[PDB]
Coordinates of C-alpha atoms and ligand atoms in Angstrom, one line a residue:
Chain A
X2 CA 0.1 -15.3 18.9
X3 CA 2.1 -16.9 16.0
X4 CA -0.3 -15.4 13.4
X5 CA 0.5 -12.8 10.8
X6 CA -0.5 -11.3 7.6
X7 CA 2.9 -11.9 6.1
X8 CA 4.2 -11.2 2.6
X9 CA 2.4 -11.7 -0.7
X10 CA 2.2 -15.5 -1.3
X11 CA 3.3 -15.1 -5.0
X12 CA 7.1 -14.6 -5.2
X13 CA 8.2 -17.4 -3.0
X14 CA 6.4 -19.9 -5.3
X15 CA 8.1 -18.7 -8.5
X16 CA 10.2 -21.3 -10.1
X17 CA 13.1 -21.4 -12.6
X18 CA 16.1 -19.2 -11.9
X19 CA 13.8 -17.2 -9.4
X20 CA 14.6 -19.8 -6.9
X21 CA 18.0 -21.3 -7.9
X22 CA 19.7 -18.0 -8.9
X23 CA 22.5 -16.6 -6.8
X24 CA 22.7 -13.2 -8.6
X25 CA 19.1 -12.1 -8.0
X26 CA 17.4 -8.7 -7.6
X27 CA 16.3 -6.7 -5.8
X28 CA 18.8 -6.5 -3.0
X29 CA 19.6 -4.2 -0.1
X30 CA 21.8 -1.2 -0.8
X31 CA 24.0 -0.3 2.2
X32 CA 24.9 3.3 2.4
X33 CA 25.5 4.0 6.0
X34 CA 27.4 0.8 6.6
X35 CA 30.7 0.2 8.4
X36 CA 32.0 -1.9 5.5
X37 CA 34.4 -0.4 2.8
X38 CA 32.6 1.1 -0.2
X39 CA 34.3 0.1 -3.5
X40 CA 34.1 3.0 -5.9
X41 CA 32.5 2.0 -9.2
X42 CA 34.8 4.4 -11.1
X43 CA 32.4 4.6 -14.0
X44 CA 31.8 8.3 -14.4
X45 CA 28.5 10.1 -14.4
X46 CA 25.4 9.2 -16.5
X47 CA 24.8 11.4 -19.5
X48 CA 21.3 11.3 -20.6
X49 CA 20.1 12.0 -24.1
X50 CA 16.4 11.3 -23.7
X51 CA 13.7 12.9 -25.8
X52 CA 11.2 15.4 -24.3
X53 CA 7.9 14.3 -26.0
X54 CA 8.3 10.7 -26.9
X55 CA 5.3 8.9 -28.4
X56 CA 4.8 5.7 -26.5
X57 CA 2.7 2.5 -26.3
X58 CA 1.4 2.0 -22.8
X59 CA 1.0 -1.8 -22.1
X60 CA -1.0 -3.3 -19.2
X61 CA 1.5 -5.9 -18.1
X62 CA -1.3 -7.7 -16.3
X63 CA 1.0 -8.1 -13.3
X64 CA 0.2 -4.8 -11.6
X65 CA 2.2 -2.1 -13.3
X66 CA 1.6 -0.6 -16.7
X67 CA 4.6 -0.4 -19.0
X68 CA 5.5 2.7 -21.1
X69 CA 7.3 1.5 -24.2
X70 CA 9.6 3.9 -26.2
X71 CA 11.0 4.1 -29.8
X72 CA 14.7 4.2 -30.4
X73 CA 16.9 7.3 -29.8
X74 CA 16.6 7.6 -26.0
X75 CA 20.1 7.0 -25.0
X76 CA 21.9 7.1 -21.7
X77 CA 25.7 7.0 -21.5
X78 CA 27.8 5.6 -18.7
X79 CA 31.2 4.0 -18.3
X80 CA 31.9 4.2 -22.1
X81 CA 28.7 2.2 -22.9
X82 CA 25.6 3.3 -24.7
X83 CA 22.2 2.2 -23.1
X84 CA 19.0 2.5 -25.2
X85 CA 15.7 2.9 -23.3
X86 CA 13.2 0.3 -24.1
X87 CA 10.5 0.9 -21.5
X88 CA 9.7 2.1 -18.0
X89 CA 7.3 0.7 -15.3
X90 CA 6.8 0.9 -11.6
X91 CA 6.8 -1.1 -8.4
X92 CA 5.2 -0.2 -5.1
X93 CA 6.7 -0.3 -2.5
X94 CA 10.2 0.2 -4.0
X95 CA 12.0 -3.2 -4.6
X96 CA 15.5 -2.2 -3.7
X97 CA 16.0 -1.0 -0.1
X98 CA 18.6 1.5 1.2
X99 CA 19.8 0.5 4.6
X100 CA 16.9 -1.9 4.9
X101 CA 14.2 0.7 4.1
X102 CA 11.9 0.7 1.0
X103 CA 10.5 3.8 -0.6
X104 CA 6.9 4.5 -1.7
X105 CA 7.6 3.4 -5.3
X106 CA 10.5 2.5 -7.6
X107 CA 10.6 3.4 -11.2
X108 CA 12.4 1.0 -13.4
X109 CA 13.8 2.3 -16.7
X110 CA 14.9 -0.7 -18.7
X111 CA 17.7 -0.3 -21.3
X112 CA 19.4 -2.4 -23.9
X113 CA 23.2 -2.0 -23.7
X114 CA 23.9 -1.4 -27.4
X115 CA 27.6 -2.2 -26.8
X116 CA 26.8 -5.6 -25.4
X117 CA 23.1 -6.6 -26.0
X118 CA 22.6 -7.3 -22.3
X119 CA 19.9 -5.6 -20.3
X120 CA 20.6 -2.6 -18.1
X121 CA 18.1 -1.3 -15.6
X122 CA 18.0 2.0 -13.9
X123 CA 16.1 2.2 -10.7
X124 CA 14.8 5.4 -9.2
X125 CA 13.2 5.7 -5.8
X126 CA 9.9 7.6 -5.7
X127 CA 9.2 9.3 -2.3
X128 CA 6.0 10.8 -1.0
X129 CA 5.7 14.5 -0.2
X130 CA 5.9 16.0 -3.7
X131 CA 3.7 18.9 -4.7
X132 CA 4.3 18.7 -8.4
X133 CA 2.6 15.8 -10.2
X134 CA 5.2 13.8 -12.0
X135 CA 3.8 14.0 -15.6
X136 CA 5.5 10.8 -16.7
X137 CA 3.8 8.7 -14.0
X138 CA 0.6 10.7 -14.6
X139 CA 0.4 10.1 -18.2
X140 CA 1.3 6.4 -17.6
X141 CA -1.7 6.1 -15.2
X142 CA -4.1 7.9 -17.5
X143 CA -3.3 6.0 -20.7
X144 CA -3.0 2.6 -19.1
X145 CA -5.5 0.2 -20.8
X146 CA -7.9 -1.6 -18.4
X147 CA -7.8 -5.0 -20.1
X148 CA -4.6 -6.9 -19.1
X149 CA -2.0 -7.4 -21.9
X150 CA -3.7 -4.7 -24.0
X151 CA -1.8 -1.7 -25.3
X152 CA -3.0 1.8 -26.3
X153 CA -0.8 4.4 -27.8
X154 CA -0.6 7.5 -25.6
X155 CA -1.9 10.8 -27.1
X156 CA 0.4 12.9 -24.9
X157 CA 4.1 12.7 -25.2
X158 CA 6.2 11.4 -22.4
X159 CA 9.4 12.8 -21.1
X160 CA 11.3 9.9 -19.4
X161 CA 13.8 12.5 -18.0
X162 CA 11.0 13.3 -15.5
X163 CA 11.7 9.9 -13.8
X164 CA 15.3 10.7 -13.1
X165 CA 16.8 12.6 -10.2
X166 CA 18.0 16.2 -10.7
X167 CA 21.7 16.7 -10.8
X168 CA 23.0 17.6 -7.4
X169 CA 24.7 20.9 -6.4
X170 CA 27.9 19.3 -7.5
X171 CA 26.6 18.2 -10.9
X172 CA 26.4 14.5 -10.1
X173 CA 23.5 11.9 -10.0
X174 CA 25.1 9.5 -7.4
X175 CA 24.3 5.8 -7.9
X176 CA 25.2 2.2 -7.1
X177 CA 26.0 -0.5 -9.6
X178 CA 25.7 -4.2 -9.2
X179 CA 25.0 -7.3 -11.3
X180 CA 21.5 -8.8 -10.9
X181 CA 18.4 -10.0 -12.6
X182 CA 14.9 -9.2 -13.7
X183 CA 12.7 -8.9 -10.6
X184 CA 9.9 -10.9 -12.2
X185 CA 9.8 -14.4 -13.8
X186 CA 11.9 -15.8 -15.5
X187 CA 14.1 -13.7 -13.2
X188 CA 16.7 -13.9 -15.8
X189 CA 20.3 -13.0 -14.7
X190 CA 23.0 -11.0 -16.4
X191 CA 21.2 -7.8 -15.9
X192 CA 23.2 -4.7 -14.9
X193 CA 21.5 -2.6 -12.3
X194 CA 22.1 1.0 -11.5
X195 CA 20.2 2.5 -8.7
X196 CA 20.1 6.1 -8.0
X197 CA 20.7 7.3 -4.5
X198 CA 18.6 10.4 -4.8
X199 CA 14.9 9.9 -4.6
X200 CA 12.3 12.0 -6.6
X201 CA 9.4 13.5 -4.7
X202 CA 6.1 12.5 -6.2
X203 CA 2.8 13.6 -4.7
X204 CA 1.0 11.1 -2.4
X205 CA -2.0 11.1 -4.6
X206 CA 0.1 9.6 -7.4
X207 CA 1.5 6.9 -5.2
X208 CA -2.0 5.9 -4.1
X209 CA -3.2 6.1 -7.7
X210 CA -0.6 3.6 -8.6
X211 CA -1.4 1.2 -5.7
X212 CA -5.0 1.6 -6.9
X213 CA -4.0 0.7 -10.4
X214 CA -2.1 -2.4 -9.1
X215 CA -5.3 -3.4 -7.2
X216 CA -7.2 -3.1 -10.5
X217 CA -9.2 0.0 -9.3
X218 CA -11.0 -2.2 -6.7
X219 CA -8.4 -2.2 -3.8
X220 CA -4.8 -1.1 -3.0
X221 CA -2.1 -3.6 -3.8
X222 CA 1.6 -4.1 -4.1
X223 CA 3.8 -5.6 -6.8
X224 CA 7.3 -6.0 -5.4
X225 CA 9.5 -9.0 -4.9
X226 CA 11.2 -9.7 -1.6
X227 CA 14.8 -8.6 -1.1
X228 CA 17.4 -11.1 -2.4
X229 CA 20.7 -12.3 -0.9
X230 CA 23.8 -10.5 -2.2
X231 CA 25.8 -13.6 -2.0
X232 CA 29.3 -13.2 -3.3
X233 CA 28.4 -10.1 -5.3
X234 CA 29.9 -6.7 -4.9
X235 CA 27.9 -3.4 -4.9
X236 CA 29.9 -0.6 -6.5
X237 CA 29.3 3.0 -5.4
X238 CA 29.5 6.0 -7.8
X239 CA 28.6 8.6 -5.2
Chain B
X2 CA 4.3 -20.1 -17.1
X3 CA 1.7 -18.2 -15.0
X4 CA 2.7 -16.2 -12.0
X5 CA 1.5 -13.4 -9.8
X6 CA 2.2 -11.6 -6.6
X7 CA -0.9 -12.6 -4.8
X8 CA -2.2 -11.5 -1.5
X9 CA -0.6 -12.0 1.8
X10 CA 0.1 -15.5 2.7
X11 CA -1.0 -15.6 6.3
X12 CA -4.8 -15.4 6.4
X13 CA -5.6 -18.4 4.2
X14 CA -3.7 -20.5 6.8
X15 CA -5.2 -19.1 10.0
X16 CA -6.7 -22.0 11.9
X17 CA -9.7 -22.7 14.1
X18 CA -12.9 -20.8 13.5
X19 CA -11.0 -18.6 11.0
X20 CA -11.3 -21.6 8.7
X21 CA -14.4 -23.4 9.8
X22 CA -16.9 -20.8 11.0
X23 CA -19.8 -19.8 8.7
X24 CA -20.3 -16.2 10.1
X25 CA -16.8 -14.8 9.3
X26 CA -15.9 -11.2 8.6
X27 CA -15.3 -9.2 6.5
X28 CA -17.8 -9.6 3.6
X29 CA -18.8 -7.8 0.5
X30 CA -21.7 -5.4 1.1
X31 CA -23.9 -5.1 -1.9
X32 CA -25.6 -1.8 -2.4
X33 CA -26.1 -1.3 -6.2
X34 CA -27.9 -4.6 -6.3
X35 CA -31.4 -5.3 -7.7
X36 CA -31.9 -7.7 -4.8
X37 CA -34.4 -6.5 -2.1
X38 CA -32.9 -5.4 1.2
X39 CA -33.9 -6.2 4.8
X40 CA -34.4 -3.0 6.7
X41 CA -32.5 -2.9 10.0
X42 CA -35.3 -0.9 11.8
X43 CA -32.9 -0.1 14.5
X44 CA -32.9 3.7 14.4
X45 CA -29.8 5.8 14.4
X46 CA -26.6 5.8 16.4
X47 CA -26.1 8.2 19.2
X48 CA -22.6 8.9 20.6
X49 CA -21.5 9.7 24.1
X50 CA -17.8 9.4 23.9
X51 CA -16.5 11.5 26.8
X52 CA -13.6 9.7 28.7
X53 CA -11.3 10.1 25.8
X54 CA -8.6 12.1 27.5
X55 CA -5.7 10.0 28.8
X56 CA -5.8 6.9 26.7
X57 CA -3.2 4.4 25.7
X58 CA -1.7 3.8 22.2
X59 CA -0.5 0.2 21.7
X60 CA 1.6 -1.4 18.9
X61 CA 0.2 -4.8 18.4
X62 CA 2.9 -6.4 16.3
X63 CA 0.2 -7.2 13.7
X64 CA 0.4 -4.1 11.7
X65 CA -2.0 -1.6 13.1
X66 CA -1.8 0.5 16.2
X67 CA -4.6 0.2 18.8
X68 CA -5.9 3.2 20.8
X69 CA -7.2 1.7 24.1
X70 CA -9.9 3.6 26.0
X71 CA -10.9 3.8 29.6
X72 CA -14.4 2.7 30.6
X73 CA -17.2 5.3 30.1
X74 CA -17.4 6.1 26.4
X75 CA -20.8 4.9 25.2
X76 CA -22.6 4.5 22.0
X77 CA -26.4 3.8 21.7
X78 CA -28.1 2.1 18.8
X79 CA -31.4 0.2 19.0
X80 CA -32.1 -0.4 22.6
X81 CA -28.5 -1.3 23.0
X82 CA -25.5 0.1 25.0
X83 CA -22.0 -0.2 23.3
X84 CA -19.0 0.5 25.5
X85 CA -15.9 1.6 23.6
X86 CA -12.8 -0.5 24.3
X87 CA -10.5 0.6 21.6
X88 CA -10.0 1.6 17.9
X89 CA -7.5 0.6 15.2
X90 CA -7.3 0.5 11.4
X91 CA -6.7 -1.6 8.3
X92 CA -5.3 -0.7 4.9
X93 CA -6.9 -1.3 2.5
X94 CA -10.4 -1.5 3.9
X95 CA -11.5 -4.9 5.2
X96 CA -15.1 -4.7 4.1
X97 CA -15.9 -4.0 0.5
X98 CA -18.9 -2.3 -1.1
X99 CA -19.8 -3.9 -4.5
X100 CA -16.4 -5.5 -4.5
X101 CA -14.6 -2.1 -3.9
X102 CA -12.2 -1.7 -1.0
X103 CA -11.4 1.7 0.3
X104 CA -8.0 3.0 1.3
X105 CA -8.4 2.5 5.0
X106 CA -11.1 1.1 7.3
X107 CA -11.4 2.3 10.9
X108 CA -12.7 -0.2 13.5
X109 CA -14.2 1.1 16.7
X110 CA -14.4 -1.9 19.0
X111 CA -17.1 -2.0 21.7
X112 CA -18.4 -4.4 24.3
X113 CA -22.2 -4.8 23.7
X114 CA -23.5 -4.5 27.3
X115 CA -26.9 -5.7 26.1
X116 CA -25.8 -9.1 24.6
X117 CA -22.4 -9.6 26.1
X118 CA -21.0 -9.8 22.5
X119 CA -18.5 -7.4 21.0
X120 CA -19.8 -4.9 18.5
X121 CA -17.6 -3.2 15.9
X122 CA -18.3 0.0 14.1
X123 CA -16.5 0.3 10.7
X124 CA -15.8 3.4 8.8
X125 CA -14.3 3.7 5.4
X126 CA -11.4 6.2 4.8
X127 CA -11.0 7.6 1.4
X128 CA -8.0 9.8 0.2
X129 CA -8.6 13.4 -0.9
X130 CA -9.2 15.1 2.4
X131 CA -8.0 18.6 3.2
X132 CA -7.7 18.1 7.0
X133 CA -5.6 15.6 8.8
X134 CA -8.0 13.4 10.8
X135 CA -7.0 14.2 14.5
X136 CA -7.7 10.7 15.9
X137 CA -5.8 9.0 13.1
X138 CA -3.1 11.8 13.4
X139 CA -2.5 11.4 17.1
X140 CA -2.7 7.7 16.7
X141 CA 0.2 7.9 14.2
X142 CA 2.2 10.4 16.2
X143 CA 2.0 8.7 19.6
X144 CA 2.1 5.1 18.4
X145 CA 5.3 3.4 19.6
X146 CA 7.3 1.9 16.8
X147 CA 8.6 -1.0 18.9
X148 CA 6.3 -4.0 18.6
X149 CA 4.2 -4.9 21.7
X150 CA 5.0 -1.6 23.3
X151 CA 2.3 0.8 24.6
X152 CA 2.5 4.5 25.4
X153 CA 0.0 6.9 27.1
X154 CA -1.3 9.6 24.8
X155 CA -0.5 13.1 26.0
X156 CA -3.3 14.7 24.0
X157 CA -6.9 13.5 24.2
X158 CA -8.0 11.3 21.3
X159 CA -11.6 12.0 20.4
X160 CA -13.0 8.8 18.8
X161 CA -16.0 10.6 17.5
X162 CA -13.7 12.1 14.9
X163 CA -13.6 8.7 13.1
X164 CA -17.4 8.7 12.4
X165 CA -18.7 10.0 9.1
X166 CA -20.7 13.3 9.0
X167 CA -24.5 13.1 9.4
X168 CA -26.4 13.2 6.1
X169 CA -28.7 15.9 5.0
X170 CA -31.5 14.0 6.9
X171 CA -29.5 13.9 10.2
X172 CA -28.6 10.2 9.8
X173 CA -25.4 8.1 9.3
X174 CA -26.6 5.2 7.0
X175 CA -25.2 1.9 7.9
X176 CA -25.4 -1.9 7.4
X177 CA -25.6 -4.4 10.2
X178 CA -24.6 -8.0 10.2
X179 CA -23.4 -10.8 12.5
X180 CA -19.8 -11.7 11.9
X181 CA -16.5 -12.4 13.5
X182 CA -13.2 -10.7 14.5
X183 CA -11.1 -10.2 11.3
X184 CA -8.0 -11.5 13.1
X185 CA -7.3 -14.8 14.9
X186 CA -9.0 -16.5 16.7
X187 CA -11.8 -15.0 14.5
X188 CA -14.4 -15.5 17.3
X189 CA -18.0 -15.3 16.1
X190 CA -20.9 -13.4 17.6
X191 CA -19.5 -9.9 16.8
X192 CA -22.2 -7.4 15.7
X193 CA -20.9 -5.5 12.7
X194 CA -22.2 -2.0 11.8
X195 CA -20.4 -0.7 8.7
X196 CA -21.1 2.9 7.8
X197 CA -21.8 3.7 4.2
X198 CA -20.4 7.3 4.2
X199 CA -16.6 7.4 4.0
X200 CA -14.6 10.1 5.5
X201 CA -12.1 11.7 3.2
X202 CA -8.5 11.8 4.6
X203 CA -5.3 13.4 3.3
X204 CA -3.3 10.9 1.3
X205 CA -0.3 11.6 3.6
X206 CA -2.1 9.9 6.5
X207 CA -3.0 6.8 4.5
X208 CA 0.6 6.4 3.4
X209 CA 1.7 7.1 6.9
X210 CA -0.5 4.3 8.2
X211 CA 0.7 1.9 5.5
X212 CA 4.1 2.9 6.6
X213 CA 3.4 2.1 10.2
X214 CA 2.0 -1.3 9.1
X215 CA 5.3 -1.8 7.4
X216 CA 7.4 -1.5 10.6
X217 CA 8.5 2.0 9.4
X218 CA 10.6 0.4 6.7
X219 CA 8.2 -0.4 3.8
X220 CA 4.5 0.0 2.9
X221 CA 2.2 -2.9 3.8
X222 CA -1.4 -4.0 4.1
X223 CA -3.2 -5.7 7.0
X224 CA -6.4 -7.0 5.7
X225 CA -8.1 -10.4 5.5
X226 CA -9.8 -11.6 2.3
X227 CA -13.6 -11.4 1.9
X228 CA -15.6 -14.2 3.5
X229 CA -18.7 -16.0 2.3
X230 CA -22.0 -14.5 3.5
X231 CA -23.4 -18.1 3.8
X232 CA -26.8 -18.1 5.6
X233 CA -26.7 -14.5 6.9
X234 CA -28.4 -11.5 5.4
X235 CA -27.3 -7.9 5.7
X236 CA -29.6 -5.4 7.4
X237 CA -29.5 -2.0 5.9
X238 CA -30.3 1.1 8.0
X239 CA -30.0 3.4 5.0
Ligands
2HP301 O1 21.5 15.2 -20.1 P1 21.9 15.2 -18.7 O2 22.5 13.8 -18.3 O3 23.1 16.3 -18.5 O4 20.7 15.6 -17.7
2HP302 O1 25.0 16.5 -21.5 P1 24.7 17.9 -21.0 O2 24.7 18.9 -22.2 O3 23.4 17.9 -20.3 O4 25.8 18.4 -20.0
2HP303 O1 5.5 13.1 2.8 P1 4.0 13.3 3.2 O2 3.8 14.4 4.3 O3 3.2 13.7 1.9 O4 3.4 11.9 3.7
2HP304 O1 12.1 -5.2 -15.1 P1 11.6 -6.0 -13.9 O2 10.0 -6.0 -13.9 O3 12.0 -7.5 -14.0 O4 12.1 -5.4 -12.6
2HP305 O1 -6.2 13.7 -3.7 P1 -6.8 12.4 -4.4 O2 -7.0 12.7 -5.9 O3 -5.8 11.2 -4.3 O4 -8.1 12.0 -3.7
2HP306 O1 -11.4 -5.8 15.3 P1 -10.9 -6.8 14.3 O2 -9.8 -6.1 13.4 O3 -10.2 -8.0 15.0 O4 -12.0 -7.3 13.4
ZN307 ZN1 10.6 -3.7 -12.6
ZN308 ZN1 -10.1 -4.5 12.8

């Protein structure tokens, strides 16, 4: 009949810009579309991330844990310098590609040192991996139980492990578009770069994360529904 | 302000008995409780599932697939004859054990020949299994992806495979309680038997099922919240 489970009741009740905004994330990312793809002409990312950062792991109390970093983790793109602030995860992925979401999505949030605005790199996490992603692994182990608490992690964290390998041609193809934080206050003016290439994590880790989101008592999600592109352009650095 | 993702939005708005009835499923099943427990004194289940070749797999448009059986598969418990009509699944589990849901719950739905009620057997699926479960596997393989569509299974689907292994005393401990269907119209007078011993399953299959629940484009759940026990008691045949 006309009964369903439906989507989580949360997001559609969010107020503020979350409802009125016209530049909201996440959005769909067409990549097998018939429409012309506007090249972002921005170059390739160059990453200067540390290999054993010492991090605070916060429990955001909204599902994901948040691994915070000290300065000196820099990513370079389009003549700007982005500094890494923190990473966290969402399951399922928040962006889709051609309408389809992935098992998880890592978000690596940066400050644009050039501008002061927020930049966010999104990486899709796919099931099927056989090597435990140590960044995600450490972030699940150190994650404090009490919401809004934060323990320092004993192990180091290499955030490079949440980025795609360079392809056979040396690229890390991506798409770029202006958007917003995916959680309240859903603030706009955020620059989004989303990597086309997923990383393969093991299925155990994805379930571990959904378990974390469900507070070790069930399996839950923490993703916002797709938003309307509106008059925005997605730019492709393939 | 405060905000969350929440749970799915559909269930709390299901109407009719879903809302008014006082014998609804699922429920939390205490086990590590001081409280004394009423023994079911019903003996152990015996299974005579035979006519499992040539059965249909149906996509219900409500998340799970449903493996329909022909007449002739019987289960016996107490003085009672349970005729298997179909099985399907939920992720995460619908019933909880001390407030803990498992990754999946299998529901084998029978007609109780002896009372003219339905009877539902309920098995928890945990991750961490080394062998694909064959019933769940074929269910996933054969299940048509188009909603409302059904397809005959080429291979035979042995429903016994969804039952936990006998304990080191020859038994499969379970709890019994009168409840309802977990989906609308939530009709009451369903006999629930929930087994206490989960079956371990490869994480691949759990994500594959959550994938199926998500129209093969996301990962989603299909579970109703827990329901008040009210006047009932839970019978334990441990
Ligand atoms: O440091 P990368 O950007 O060459 O990996
Ligand atoms: O920035 P490079 O040294 O990884 O090419
Ligand atoms: O990609 P899978 O086979 O781990 O589900
Ligand atoms: O950084 P997010 O949580 O707003 O996506
Ligand atoms: O393989 P497990 O650790 O997810 O059970
Ligand atoms: O068999 P159920 O899922 O309607 O309880
Ligand atoms: Zn995020
Ligand atoms: Zn069910």
